[PDB]
Amino acid sequence: NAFEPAFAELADAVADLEANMMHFQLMHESLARFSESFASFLYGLNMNAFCVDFP
Amino acid sequence: SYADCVCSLRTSLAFLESSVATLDNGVQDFPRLCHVLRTVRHYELIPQTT
């Protein structure tokens, strides 16, 4: 009754929040895959060094 | 006959000398790394996790 356009503004704000949160979710997943590849990469690198540590 | 033989054979040996000379200038550094990696070659792998 009193906050009709106010709640419309809230609807817009939550829509923007949904957009930013989707970008966060997506980009964090992207970085998760990135980090996992580089983690397993250097992991196995350490494993090879951990097994046959050169002179 | 002999003229062609001596000239051509001399050129052959000259180019062979060129070959080995440039190879000296471009490969002489290998034995250092060879000795290095021979010392590094001690490898044995057993994946404990596998």
Instruction: Say whether B40 and A51 touch across the interface (CB within 8 A).
Output: no
Tokens representing B21? Answer: 């000379």
Q: Which has the closest alpha carbon to A43: B15, B14, B47?
A: B47
* Rounded Cα–Cα distance for residues A45 and B43 (Å): 15
- A53 contacts chain B (CB < 8 A): no
Given resolution (angstroms): 4.5
Contact A52 B39 (CB under 8 A): no
Which experiment gave this structure?
A: cryo-EM
A chain contacts of residue B43, beta-carbon cutoff 8 Å: 52
Tell how far CA B33 is from the center of its chain: 13
The secondary structure of B1-50 as a DSSP string is -HHHHHHHHHHHHHHHHHHHHHHHHHHTTHHHHHHHHHHH-------S--
Q: Could you give the C-alpha distances from A39 to A21, A25, A29, A33, in angstroms and in order?
A: 26, 20, 15, 10
